[PDB]
Design a binder for this molecule. Structure first.
Ligand SMILES: [Zn+2]
Ligand SMILES: [Zn+2]
Lengths: 148, 50, 148, 148, 107, 66, 50, 53, 49, 348, 146
RNA sequence: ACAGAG
């Protein structure tokens, strides 16, 4: 039936041999004949649910049912690029005599993750190269190598 | 004839191929030159066709 | 009514040169009441058409059967009774080439009419008395529903 | 210390050289199912008129080599065949021709065509734009011919 | 310091306007387009980035009747905020329920 | 010169897996088994250890010392 | 390298630059993107009027 | 002779000018500034005689 | 020939006119036997992208 | 007084790639300042300079006089040098991924709903098209679903508002035109633009690209002025990557692997060709050869061997192109003429 | 970090600050955050015999189970979540026309792996508030204009 | 004077 194809067209993403068909998102008002696709908060609150299927230290897997691509993608992009953390920016060097170059060492120390909780700190203002208790932390690395 | 841990006290790489000189600090390489074989009869055509 | 043309057709061929496309099929039809052959491109994903089918094809100048030519911009959202409720497949396109037939050298009456539905063509060839009202640069509605 | 930027010349170990053109974030890269986004998107138009099938096999041999920890040889007039690395990719759950179901990172919807992922050994060339940008308003001149 | 700038079209009385969302990208743009297109009073909606160096998006909204295009924009913002509030509540409930069910096992 | 701290593609902290990778190769694993035992699922993380050359272990022979 | 070809018919000019190029389709077909490091060096003498 | 002209492979192909089957083709590659291929075609069923790239 | 890479094991004790190095080089994932013969992967030039 | 201001937005600046073979190797543009370190321009302009972005250096010249500006803007601008002075053919036109992305947009298969049609059309609303009203066209299919065909979305480029006076009219053959259709061909390879609506046929190299006349931008240049041919190329340059980078378009080793239909044909062709060449060898060395007119008996053998060997390439290449599916990537890139040909596909 | 030889010395001082991941990639809290739609591989015709065995090897190792009802092997889909869609069902010629590989559109499977700054259930609850936050800021500028 | 690059 053609109604079967209309229902597959707005609810499934088939995978052919040569290309994935039905890739877009279509349930908008006026796109279909007898269907009403205008915004309805009750239908969204009735169909949405979250199933957490696995969680341990430093990993999480869960399901979201009922949300669309343009919001799950927003959540992925916020988790990649807009959730703040604490990381090293300034490295002040006193007597680096290692073979590792100072720029390369600063770049390596930049990428170490820090266990500070970033809900407690504020942004350092424009300039203000010292920084105070409110908006910075400060580690000290000092290693000297000798013979056994 | 040295071992790789004795290239260390000469500040030299073991994998440096050599074959080059050191003249006033720069490293110069005498390239392989290609010549014609001497003492051989060459039968050739002139510009005039002869 | 703003009907240009109406006859029951009958499918004679589906793919003459093969399956060149995935969603479009170049139908070849022929009527009962007159001798009208009908080249047509339909969308066989949303609306499957088989080999021996028999559908009723109305071409209307307007979609509201009160004869009002009010089409400034088509609103798909609005729900008011139109001509389309009695038909399963409706397209919208423009007549762009009325062309004389070159088969006969004297005393001929067959005229071709080409309607392009944004890329999906339709030749409607037959007697000149049936094609009255087809003008170039005129926008028409194709309407179509299968029969038993 | 120089970081790559718009205008630095990378190569590809098959003569498909090319300058940098754009630097986009991780959140706008297309991502696979496993979470991998590419480092370097390469345009497929370099391949038909240049006929580097060797890069297309280097990618597949590398992808089949890192999934089971081997170095597949690419020796001249020999090397590991396609029929052997097609069996190492199916065994680890990937497609046998390296084409992956890829979700667009801008819209969140899947892409229609499949995209061909793998590790390719790119080498960075000495031609950098910071050593070549040059300008002159009016400056020192020659002594004989008083021209710059 | 101003983040929103409303640029009307040439000959349209306030029902065709291009919103310039400063310091944004595809993140807010696609989600807000999705929630504006749900409104059945909207004929046209879609965004674009001006240039990949500049952090602007130009969101164009064209409505059908005579109502101005500020109202579907504000309705899109409010409905997206409510959707995110509800998703947050359901997610925190499911996290607490999974941690509660794991604490009942293996004891 | 030295093992990078993070993988270039995704961002998993690879840089603490190198001293463990050599130790698992001292226990005579194959590389495809040691990379699985360290927790590297995707191949972008696997090529960080699989293709790395440890040049600083040999550059430190020519460093000046006491 | 004489006078006529090297210094008279063709000669070195100032107010000129030279850089590696790279594509940009978000520009028009009659625009070009000059880097700011070259836009500060190159000057156009604009006369003051009303 | 015409047979001395058409003892080359190609026939029943398509030229962009007159589409005729009786043809006489040519292919070159000996200019590596041209990364695209190089072809030249002769088409003489109706004796039209095109010679293009 | 123009690829950035490493020169040798004495590339830090060496003072040349112009020396280019790469910070984190990687050996090739697909390699010829000639690479094994000339010991290229003891000091490579390039990264696996 | 003279203030020597910096180079600002709108200065007429010359621009040059150094081996200058014709007069379009140096044209004048309008400068815009951007924070990176390279000269940048639209890729439609890559044809006159013969630039290729592989470590390419181009020159710049800022003219220092008002008359040097106005002789550079009126005479030497890009909008006034679209055609070459040699044979009148357009050079500034579309190039690869602007031809491939527009060929796939204007095939008959592609349909858009209202959301994705608005998303593709709204890409061109930047710059001097920021004030214009959009003019979404009426949808083609109405009753079972609502679908815009991709040709209407393409025709937004030729007329993006309701008051734009462009009426473009073009009626020509495509590349894969079969010869017998004339606007009803099976290949859908016959182009009809009528009042800037695309009524049939996909867009090839010979309709959007820099090859020759019957270019739609050349029609807009000759009928509606310079500025309407320049805006449409910017709209195409804006709109075609937005479609092509969200459709996805990729090549693979499976796009050049020979099927089972080819490996049986190629074996038979090699056997027949090598047997006929061996018979010609034996007929030369051990008796009479039918000596072709004008050549010796050794040169007659050369022509017959080149005859038998070049039949193998044709019957091997016409056997692989019959069994390639559509949505093959080199086949798509060769049908739209953007990069490659059929000789390259049949050769690799 | 580094590696030393006797006589060499490293002494420095670091200053950690707050920043978002759009600025620089050392601020990103996650290793990789992504999703996929959930598969629903469905069987169009009942597959029995030894074709049930070759159907279970054109998939992931835990999605197609083979069971016997009368000592006769029938195949059914068991856990379609575990599939990676390697598309090995299209190399086999007889079985291309019995399956419909698909994806449910409105069912996502997120997989967030935190780098260790804070646990990953707290990352998602912070990411939702940011999108709640950006919709708040432009509501405050619709009120400031009018 | 030599090597590069397009
Ligand atoms: Zn990784
Ligand atoms: Zn011809």
């Amino acid at each position: 039936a053609a109604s079967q194809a209309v229902e597959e067209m707005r609810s499934r993403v088939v995978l052919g041999e040569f290309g994935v068909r039905n890739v877009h998102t279509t349930d908008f008002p006026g796109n279909y004949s007898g269907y009403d696709d205008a915004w309805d908060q009750d239908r969204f609150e009735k169909n949405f649910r979250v199933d957490v299927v696995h969680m341990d230290e430093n990993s999480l897997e869960f399901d979201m049912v009922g949300i669309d691509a343009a919001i799950a993608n927003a959540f992925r992009r916020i988790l990649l690029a807009e959730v703040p953390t604490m990381a090293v920016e300034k490295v002040l060097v006193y007597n680096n005599t290692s073979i590792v170059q100072d720029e390369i060492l600063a770049h390596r120390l930049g990428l170490i993750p820090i266990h500070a909780d970033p809900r407690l700190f504020e942004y350092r203002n424009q300039g203000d190269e010292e920084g105070t208790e409110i908006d910075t932390l400060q580690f000290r690395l000092q290693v000297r190598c000798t013979r056994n | 004839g040295k071992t790789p841990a004795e290239f260390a006290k000469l500040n030299e790489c073991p994998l440096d191929p050599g074959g080059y000189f050191i003249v006033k600090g720069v490293e110069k390489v005498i390239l392989i030159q290609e010549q014609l074989s001497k003492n051989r009869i060459i039968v050739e055509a002139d510009r005039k066709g002869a | 009514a703003g009907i240009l043309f109406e006859d029951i057709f009958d499918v004679k061929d589906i793919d003459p040169e093969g399956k060149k496309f995935d969603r479009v099929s170049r139908l070849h039809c022929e009527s009962e009441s007159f001798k009208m052959d009908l080249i047509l491109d339909v969308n066989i994903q949303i609306y499957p058409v088989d080999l021996g089918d028999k559908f009723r094809l109305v071409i209307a100048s307007t979609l509201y059967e009160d004869g009002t030519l009010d089409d400034g911009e088509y609103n798909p959202t609005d729900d008011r009774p139109s001509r389309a409720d009695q038909f399963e497949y409706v397209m919208y396109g423009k007549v762009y080439r009325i062309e004389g037939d070159e088969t006969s050298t004297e005393a001929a009456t067959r005229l071709s009419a080409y309607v392009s539905y944004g890329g999906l063509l339709m030749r409607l060839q037959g007697d000149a008395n049936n094609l009255h009202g087809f003008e170039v640069d005129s926008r028409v509605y194709l309407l179509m529903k299968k029969l038993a | 210390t120089r970081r790559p930027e718009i205008g630095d010349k990378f190569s590809s170990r098959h003569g498909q050289k090319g300058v940098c053109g754009l630097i986009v974030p991780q959140e706008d890269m297309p991502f696979c199912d496993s979470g991998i986004c590419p480092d370097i998107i390469m345009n497929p138009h370099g391949f038909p008129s240049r006929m580097t099938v060797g890069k297309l096999i280097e990618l597949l041999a590398g992808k089949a080599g890192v999934l089971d920890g081997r170095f597949h040889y690419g020796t001249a007039f020999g090397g590991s065949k396609v029929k052997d690395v097609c069996e190492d990719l199916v065994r680890h759950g990937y497609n046998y021709l390296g084409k992956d179901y890829v979700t667009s990172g801008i819209t969140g919807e899947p892409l229609e065509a499949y995209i061909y992922f793998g590790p390719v050994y790119y080498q960075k060339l000495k031609h950098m734009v910071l050593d070549k940008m040059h300008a002159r308003a009016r400056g020192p001149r020659a002594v004989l011919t008083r021209q710059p | 310091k101003t983040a929103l700038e409303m640029v009307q079209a040439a000959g349209t009385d306030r029902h065709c306007v291009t919103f310039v969302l400063h310091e944004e990208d595809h993140t807010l743009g696609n989600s807000l387009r999705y929630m504006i297109m749900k409104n059945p009073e909207v004929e046209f909606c879609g965004y674009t980035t001006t240039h990949p160096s500049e952090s602007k998006i130009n969101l164009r909204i064209q409505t059908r009747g005579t109502l101005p295009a500020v109202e579907p924009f504000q309705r899109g913002l409010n409905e997206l905020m409510n959707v995110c509030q509800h998703v947050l509540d359901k997610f925190e409930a499911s996290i607490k329920d999974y941690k509660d069910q794991k604490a009942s096992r293996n004891e | 010169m030295i093992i990078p701290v993070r993988c270039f593609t995704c961002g998993k902290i690879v840089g603490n897996k190198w001293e463990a990778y050599l130790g698992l190769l001292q226990a005579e694993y194959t590389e495809g088994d040691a990379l699985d035992a360290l927790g590297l699922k995707r191949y972008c993380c696997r090529r960080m250890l699989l293709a790395h050359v440890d040049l600083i272990e040999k550059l430190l022979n020519y460093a000046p010392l006491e | 390298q004489g006078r006529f070809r090297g210094n008279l018919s063709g000669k070195r000019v100032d107010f000129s630059g030279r850089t590696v190029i790279s594509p940009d389709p978000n520009l028009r077909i009659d625009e070009v993107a000059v880097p700011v490091h070259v836009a500060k060096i190159l000057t156009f003498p604009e006369k003051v009027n009303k | 002779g015409a047979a001395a002209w058409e003892n080359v492979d190609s026939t029943a192909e398509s030229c962009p000018k007159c589409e005729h089957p009786r043809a006489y083709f040519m292919q070159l590659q000996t200019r590596s500034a041209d990364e695209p291929m190089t072809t030249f075609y002769k088409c003489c069923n109706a004796q039209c005689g095109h010679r293009w790239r | 020939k123009q690829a950035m890479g490493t020169i040798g094991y004495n590339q830090r004790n060496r003072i040349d006119t112009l020396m280019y190095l790469l910070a984190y080089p990687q050996k090739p994932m697909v390699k010829t036997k000639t690479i094994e013969l000339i010991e290229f992967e003891k000091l490579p030039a390039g990264q696996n992208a | 007084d003279i203030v020597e201001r910096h180079l600002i937005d709108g200065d007429v600046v010359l621009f040059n790639r150094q081996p200058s073979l014709h007069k379009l190797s140096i044209m004048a543009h309008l400068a815009r300042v951007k924070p990176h370190r390279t000269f940048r321009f639209n890729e439609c302009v890559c044809t006159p300079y013969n630039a290729d972005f592989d470590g390419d250096e181009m020159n710049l010249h800022l003219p220092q006089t008002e008359e040097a500006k106005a002789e550079a803007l009126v005479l030497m601008g890009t909008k006034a040098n679209l055609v070459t002075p040699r044979n009148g053919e357009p050079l500034i036109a579309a190039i690869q991924d602007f031809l491939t992305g527009a060929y796939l947009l204007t095939l008959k298969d592609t349909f858009f709903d209202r959301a994705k049609a608005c998303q593709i059309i709204a890409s061109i609303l930047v710059g001097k098209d920021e004030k214009i009203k959009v003019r979404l066209p009426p949808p083609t299919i109405l009753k079972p679903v609502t679908l815009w065909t991709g040709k209407q979305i393409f025709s937004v480029i030729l007329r993006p508002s309701d008051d734009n006076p462009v009426r473009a009219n073009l009626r020509t053959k495509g590349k894969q035109y079969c010869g017998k259709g004339e606007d009803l061909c099976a290949n859908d390879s016959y182009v009809t633009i009528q009042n800037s609506e695309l009524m049939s046929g996909s867009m090839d190299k010979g309709t959007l690209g820099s090859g020759s006349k019957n270019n739609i931008f050349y029609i807009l240049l000759r009928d509606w002025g310079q500025n309407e041919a320049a805006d449409a190329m910017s709209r195409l340059a804006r709109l075609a990557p937005v479609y092509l980078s969200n459709r996805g378009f990729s090549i693979g080793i499976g796009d050049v692997t020979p099927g089972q239909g080819l490996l049986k044909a190629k074996y038979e062709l090699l056997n027949a060709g090598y047997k006929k060449c061996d018979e010609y060898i034996e007929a030369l060395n051990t008796g009479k050869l039918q000596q072709q007119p004008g050549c010796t008996a050794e040169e007659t053998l050369e022509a017959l061997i080149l005859k038998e060997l070049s039949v193998i390439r044709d019957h091997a290449g016409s056997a692989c192109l019959r069994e390639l599916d559509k949505s093959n990537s080199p086949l798509t890139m060769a049908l739209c003429g953007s990069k490659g040909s059929f000789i390259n596909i049949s050769q690799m | 970090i580094a590696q030393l030889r006797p006589g060499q010395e490293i002494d420095l001082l670091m200053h950690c600050v707050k920043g978002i991941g759009k600025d620089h990639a050392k601020f990103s809290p996650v290793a990789t955050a992504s999703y996929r739609l959930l598969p629903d591989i469905t069987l169009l015709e009942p597959v029995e015999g030894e074709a049930a065995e070759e159907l279970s090897r054109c998939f992931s190792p835990g999605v197609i189970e083979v069971q016997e009802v009368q000592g006769k092997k029938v195949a059914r889909v068991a856990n379609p979540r575990l599939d990676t869609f390697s598309r090995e069902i299209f190399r086999n010629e007889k079985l291309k026309k019995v399956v419909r590989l698909a994806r449910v559109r409105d069912h996502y499977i997120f997989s967030v792996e935190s780098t260790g700054v804070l646990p990953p259930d707290v990352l998602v609850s912070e990411a939702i508030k940011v999108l709640m936050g950006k919709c708040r800021r432009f509501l405050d500028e619709l009120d400031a204009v009018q």
